[PDB]
Design a protein around this nucleic acid. Structure first.
Ligand SMILES: [Mg+2]
Ligand SMILES: [Zn+2]
Ligand SMILES: [Zn+2]
Ligand SMILES: [Zn+2]
Lengths: 515, 429, 417
RNA sequence: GUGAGUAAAAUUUGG
RNA sequence: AAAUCUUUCUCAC
């Protein structure tokens, strides 16, 4: 039915592909493709463009965003049991904590300074050395990336070492800064819609618009290209270490370590890869491998193709195409006058993943659709009513609600089917605030997060250091006694104010309440 | 009792960020296993019971949105709805009142959200989320006429005062002007002087509303300092003087420039609730502040230094009118008091910015080619590019003076794309 | 405020007390000595004199308020401050030389830079690839899509019945008869019965894929919503017959038979055999007590079943209907049939898309969007984007791909663009 | 249902 | 048996 749409439609209404198959096959295919490219047979991974014009950032102070170095996402931690290397899957926070414990460094900034200020590779930093760190940082673990619409065969993603992430954060931050300073229109941090709106204005001056994707983008970005880009912007020894680790990377497939001399393992350096092209020309509006440009004559098209080839951006002959009545980037399509193309476009459906969370996500999706010209408001209201009815059909069971309050949604035993406009205008029972896209977290969302905090890879016995002074910076150092004292003082204050836990705060509702 | 040693081995002290990263329990990921997790052990059922018993009664009630305006279908554009964060004093007070420290800490950061919108109002009003089609505005209907006229770019009924036209200051207005080294804030009843030492805004009465507005504009932290004093102070004279009122809407801070590094504020008007910059509005705004110094009222995509360098490079080869336009743009995009050489006359031109064949700058999502501006394109002559020689279905004929868009020209029997048309950027000459 | 001086600040305080016991100097780098609800204006704060103190190096100003007292650390011998008492404190406390490390820059060249560069040089390097020849041509015509569909048909063929897709239509049995038939079908297949639930046991695997053929389209699918809801519900409650308003299913966990001690309960990875009922008429007919019904099975892993069960059929159909052209009547094999076709087969195609956990139709949809929006494409390469049979395996994905291609052909025929 | 170990224990699955 | 290297783990309490 996506084929019989009057307007543009990507068929995103259903979820993406998924399966339980192991990621060994996909990782092997990716590594084989990278190896084949290294031989100089299929594609080109040798960068011949000129990057001598990029500004030098070697004099900038070395700073690290600590928040970007801690997350609940997975990563690979390398240990040595009996002289054999073991790669373990651990939360990135746990991996970085283990790295800091091994190096006996208070913070990652201290660790990077110590790494950059050791007289030799063999000098010991705590319980390790720069040589051992470089050896361990080249190990990766494979996993599957499912739920990617339009990819029936799931791709392989890779988990890296905390040291690799620590250096990658610095190099990527500096690459993003250089892009902001050099690109004709900065788009690294912009959304797909903003990129499309800017690209329309940029390409309005020419007849033909080339909408381009590259093929096997990560497998054709070599360590030499990364080192060239990092030297052009003055990354010093950090870039050298990162390139050395990239060249010697090894992927753990099932139970065997496989060498991957070529490639960069599925977007490890998006900003650097983009800079590899943006640093040689300003005729492309691009990020990652998604780019848009414009031309008037076949000679300009040949020049564009030569520029793409010289930058190791191998055009995807399957997907790239030329147009004259529309432009498209990041799955967003506009007419040449900057108007959104009629049709559903990239609008995606909402699956049943919880009584209230599904309604909240549907409300957000419909708000986005109606704010643009995708859908009239009455159609969105009808769709929201239908979604409420289906949620009632799916969730109004004793397994979920065991309640009958009138103000509750019909899917929780109530008799209330909220109007879309009423919900969006806050003209509803307080229970419906969480269903509002801008409202608080839904009950389903909170319970799921609390349960996820208790998994084997994330559970911990450490006492949470909550309810902190809004003034104390988070970069300050504390010990066990310090946290004990802080908690005791806060509890004493709360008890003196006749409370045992801090009052809940919602800033949006707080602002709305103010006269 | 001893888990600190196990979690952090060989270290006696760790950062707050690392310690708090180990106990994250407020992150939700939508996964295929949601239904099974919610069903297991009636987790969601028990959570709903607890929420209805204990959490729901404590939820405060809030009012509903009522203000509406007539909207029309329009070209897709990015709407920037800046939400200010809690101030330091308010955050400290709330924390002292026993509120959750983590949430209040998260609330101090001003947050900017850009959303696509395809509806426009007669006054370029901003809209609530999901209600652009119905025209629910972030603003509320004003009571008196002066409030309505202050925000209006073209007030309907002038009152003989600066708020709604050329004139002097009323009692409900105030101004902030930079005199020498000191910021003079005059309401009309109280006069104050402020200065920035390192990152604070030293003043006698930081609670002064004009002082708060100045601190927001300068991006500093209010701080009490009775030692601040000034010698030259022509605040009464300018207060009793009359200044021309620009035909521009309020900047994001809710003020309107009236002199070099001088801004007018209204007591009962807060942050701007209407779109400050637009295709039809950008160049008038730039011209309004060509000689008023940096404003900081426009967001530029990318490095401000690079944008200023490109502006200077275009300024080198421009004409007096184009030069004034470029200077106005530079003033518009430059933050106030952040050591930026926005004066294109005194800015050192670099030759590395002259090698590119086009100078592009993006202001509030609007991409402008400075070389084309120098050639008098956006203001004098429109740009035309032929898309095809065939008639496309569903496209209107070419008007006499076309605005930006795609039209069928029957004289040339071709589809044309008009861009940089004065009919869009300079509608009223 | 810079962490470099934090240690220095800690030395400066050194348990100095005022007012007979109370600490004199409060360090701004300490989470317990800091005064709550007070912005910091220096490295430390003297309570007795109520003044902030900041430490600076000779000729290196720091961003602090002017009123803050500065204790300049001279390069060679002494420490000089505006206040004499602070100078004396610096002299007495800094008995040793706590030299502070300098600011490290990103472009800092380490001692091992040359060695690592040599090592990287000695490692393998890529070789230049061939410059590809790009030829731009018109997008593929209807003939190419027809050829792809014909190739699929010839290669794989068609089944005699619709298999599990037939479950989208009601079977002529009531709830009790449906439960009876499903239970007796489970019994006839030697499914183990335990704890009031059915289990399918396996010992060896042929380790080769099952036969793949295209599923003919049933007339309609009025029970798509119930079917998807029941598929969602069953895997979480497998082993028992689950009913709905008009249909029933049975999800049987598939666990290895390991002798006397065998897996008694499924974990997060046990696969499920979903068994459903449809009108009889094929090789899968089952008879019991005069009740006749076709019994069809589907082997799913937990992720596939979760993906299939969470799709919303009604909302998807309405969203598609919002901006949809007239749907032509199609035959049992996806061909245009104006005289004897049915328009309700599109609901069946949508149900097949929902059932296809591979979602191969999304790739066809994206490529068709590109095709519609394209003026020129690469020669012989854009067309190959419609050849996706090598990326999928199974009857359901194969049929989904075939009918997506059929829909593309039908659109190109009925409503040429 | 509560924890500990296995190149893993479902927030799995990274940038 | 099927959407076929998948349908999968131990210990203390
Ligand atoms: Mg891409
Ligand atoms: Zn007035
Ligand atoms: Zn004054
Ligand atoms: Zn059959």
């Amino acid at each position: 039915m996506w084929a019989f749409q009057e307007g543009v439609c990507k068929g995103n209404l259903l979820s993406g592909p998924t399966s339980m198959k192991a990621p060994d096959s996909a990782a092997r295919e990716s590594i084989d493709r990278a190896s084949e490219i290294m031989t100089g047979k299929s594609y080109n991974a040798v960068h011949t463009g000129d990057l001598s014009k990029l500004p030098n950032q070697g004099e900038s102070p070395l700073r690290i965003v600590d928040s970007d170095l801690y997350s609940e996402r997975s990563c690979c931690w390398v240990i040595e049991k009996e002289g054999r290397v073991v790669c373990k899957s651990t939360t990135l926070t746990r991996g970085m904590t283990s790295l800091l414990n091994t190096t006996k460094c208070s913070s990652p900034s201290e660790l990077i300074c110590k790494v950059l200020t050791v007289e030799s590779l063999s000098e010991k930093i705590g319980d390790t050395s720069v040589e051992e760190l470089l050896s361990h940082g080249r190990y990766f673990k494979c996993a599957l990336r499912d739920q990617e619409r339009g990819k029936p065969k799931s791709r392989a993603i890779f988990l890296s070492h905390p040291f690799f992430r620590l250096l990658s954060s610095v190099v990527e931050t500096h690459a993003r800064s250089v892009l902001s300073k050099v690109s004709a229109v900065y788009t690294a941090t912009a959304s797909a819609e903003q990129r499309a709106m800017m690209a329309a204005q940029v390409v309005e001056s020419r007849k033909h618009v080339l909408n381009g994707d590259c093929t096997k983008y990560n497998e054709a970005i070599d360590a030499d290209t990364l080192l060239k880009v990092w030297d052009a912007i003055g990354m010093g020894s950090i870039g050298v270490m990162l390139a050395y680790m990239v060249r010697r990377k090894c992927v753990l497939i099932k139970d065997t370590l496989v060498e991957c001399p070529g490639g960069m393992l599925m977007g490890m350096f998006n900003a650097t890869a983009t800079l590899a092209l943006q640093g040689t020309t300003d005729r492309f509006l691009s990020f990652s491998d998604d780019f848009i440009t414009s031309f008037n004559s076949p000679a300009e098209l040949r020049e564009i193709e030569d520029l793409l080839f010289a930058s190791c951006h191998n055009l995807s002959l399957k997907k790239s195409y030329i147009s004259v009545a529309s432009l498209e980037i990041n799955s967003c399509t506009l007419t040449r006058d900057g108007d959104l193309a009629t049709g559903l476009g990239c609008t995606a459906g909402v699956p049943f993943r919880g009584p209230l969370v599904t309604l909240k996500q549907t409300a957000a999706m419909l708000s986005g659709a109606v704010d643009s010209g995708v859908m009239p408001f009455h159609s969105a209201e009808r769709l929201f009513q239908i979604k409420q009815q289906e949620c009632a059909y799916r969730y109004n069971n004793p397994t979920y609600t065991t309640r009958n309050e009138d103000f509750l949604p019909t899917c929780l035993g109530g008799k209330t089917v909220i109007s879309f406009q009423s919900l969006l205008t806050w003209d509803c029972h307080p229970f419906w605030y969480q269903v509002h896209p801008d409202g608080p977290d839904t009950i389903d969302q909170k319970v799921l997060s609390v349960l996820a905090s208790k998994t084997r890879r994330r559970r911990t016995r450490l006492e949470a250091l909550s309810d902190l002074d809004p003034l104390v910076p988070h970069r300050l150092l504390v010990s066990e006694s310090d946290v004990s004292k802080i908690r005791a003082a806060r509890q004493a204050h709360l008890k003196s104010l006749g409370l045992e836990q801090p009052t809940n705060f919602n800033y949006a509702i707080y602002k709305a309440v103010q006269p | 009792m001893s888990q600190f040693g196990k979690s952090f081995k060989g270290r006696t002290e760790v950062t707050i960020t690392e310690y708090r990263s180990h106990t994250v329990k407020d992150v939700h990921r939508s996964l295929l296993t949601a239904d099974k997790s919610l069903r297991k052990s009636f987790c969601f059922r028990n959570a709903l019971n607890q929420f209805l018993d204990k959490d729901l009664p404590l939820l405060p009630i809030r009012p509903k949105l009522e203000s509406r305006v007539a909207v029309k279908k329009s070209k897709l554009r990015s709407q920037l709805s800046f939400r200010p964060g809690l101030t330091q004093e308010e955050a400290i007070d709330l924390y002292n009142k026993g509120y959750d420290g983590d949430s209040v800490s998260g609330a101090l950061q001003d947050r900017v959200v850009n959303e696509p919108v395809a509806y426009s109002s007669a006054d370029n009003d901003k809209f609530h989320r999901g209600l652009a089609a119905l025209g629910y505005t972030l603003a509320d209907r004003a009571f008196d006429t002066c409030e309505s006229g202050f925000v209006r770019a073209i007030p309907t009924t002038p009152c003989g005062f600066i708020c709604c036209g050329p004139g002097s200051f009323k009692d409900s207005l105030g101004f902030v002007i930079k005199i020498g080294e000191f910021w003079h804030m005059y309401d009309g009843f109280q006069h104050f002087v402020a200065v920035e030492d390192a990152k604070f805004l030293a003043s006698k009465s930081p609670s002064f509303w004009l002082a708060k507005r100045l601190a927001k504009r300068l991006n500093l932290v209010p701080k009490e300092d009775p030692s601040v004093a000034a010698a030259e102070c022509p605040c009464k004279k300018v207060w009793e003087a009359s200044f021309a009122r620009a035909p521009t809407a309020l900047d994001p801070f809710g003020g309107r420039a009236f002199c070099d590094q001088g801004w007018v504020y209204h007591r009962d008007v807060g942050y701007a609730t209407a779109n400050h910059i637009s295709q039809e509005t950008l160049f008038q705004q730039a011209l309004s502040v060509r000689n008023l110094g940096p404003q900081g009222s426009a967001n530029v995509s990318g490095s401000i230094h690079t944008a200023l360098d490109r502006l200077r490079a275009a300024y080198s080869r421009g004409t007096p009118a184009s030069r004034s336009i470029l200077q106005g743009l530079a003033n518009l995009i430059t933050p106030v008091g952040e050591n930026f050489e926005c004066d294109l006359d005194k800015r050192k031109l670099n030759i590395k910015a002259l090698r590119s064949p086009e100078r592009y700058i993006t202001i509030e999502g609007l991409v402008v080619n400075l070389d084309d501006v120098v050639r008098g394109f956006y203001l004098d002559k429109a740009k035309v590019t032929v898309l095809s020689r065939s008639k496309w279905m569903g496209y209107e004929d070419l008007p006499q003076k076309p605005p930006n868009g795609t039209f069928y020209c029957r004289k040339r029997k071709a589809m044309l794309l008009i861009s940089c048309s004065p009919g869009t950027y300079a509608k009223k000459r | 405020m810079d962490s470099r001086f934090a240690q220095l600040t800690g030395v400066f305080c050194d348990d100095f007390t005022y007012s007979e016991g109370s600490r004199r100097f409060l360090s701004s780098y300490s989470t317990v000595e800091r005064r709550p609800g007070v912005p910091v204006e220096g490295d430390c704060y003297d309570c007795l004199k109520n003044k902030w103190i900041a430490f600076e190096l000779e000729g290196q100003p720091r961003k602090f308020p002017k009123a803050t007292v500065r204790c300049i650390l001279n390069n060679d011998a002494t420490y000089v401050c505006s206040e004499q008492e602070y100078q004396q404190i610096c002299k007495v406390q800094f008995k040793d030389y706590l030299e502070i490390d300098g600011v490290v820059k990103v472009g800092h060249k380490a001692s091992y830079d040359a060695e690592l560069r040599e090592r990287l040089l000695e490692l393998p390097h890529p070789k230049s690839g061939p410059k590809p020849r790009i030829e731009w041509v018109a997008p593929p015509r209807l003939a190419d899509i027809s050829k792809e569909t014909a190739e699929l048909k010839r290669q794989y063929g068609f089944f005699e019945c619709s298999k599990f897709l037939a479950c989208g239509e009601e079977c002529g049995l009531d709830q009790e008869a449906r439960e009876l038939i499903l239970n007796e079908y489970a019994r006839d297949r030697e499914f183990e019965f335990r704890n009031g639930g059915w289990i399918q046991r396996y010992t060896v695997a042929s380790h080769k894929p099952a036969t793949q053929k295209i599923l003919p389209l049933p007339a309609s699918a009025p029970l798509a919503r119930e079917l998807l809801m029941l598929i969602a519900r069953s895997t979480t409650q497998a082993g028992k017959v689950l009913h709905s308003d008009n249909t029933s299913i049975l999800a049987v966990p598939v666990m290895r038979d390991s002798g006397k001690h065998s897996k008694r309960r499924p974990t997060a990875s046990t696969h499920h055999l979903v068994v459903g009922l449809s009108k009889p008429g094929c090789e899968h007919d089952f008879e019991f007590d005069g009740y006749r019904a076709a019994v069809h099975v589907m082997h799913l892993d937990p992720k596939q079943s979760a993906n299939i069960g969470e799709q919303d059929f009604v909302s998807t159909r309405e969203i598609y209907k919002l901006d949809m052209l007239e749907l032509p009547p199609i035959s049992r094999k996806g061909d245009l049939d104006r005289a004897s076709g049915l328009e309700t087969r599109w609901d069946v195609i949508l149900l097949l898309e929902c059932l296809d956990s591979t979602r191969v139709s999304q790739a066809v949809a994206q490529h068709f969007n590109r095709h519609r929006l394209a003026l020129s494409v690469c020669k012989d390469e854009f067309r190959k984007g419609y050849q996706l049979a090598s990326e999928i395996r199974g009857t359901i994905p194969l049929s989904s791909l075939y009918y997506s291609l059929c829909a593309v052909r039908l659109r190109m025929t009925v409503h040429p663009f």
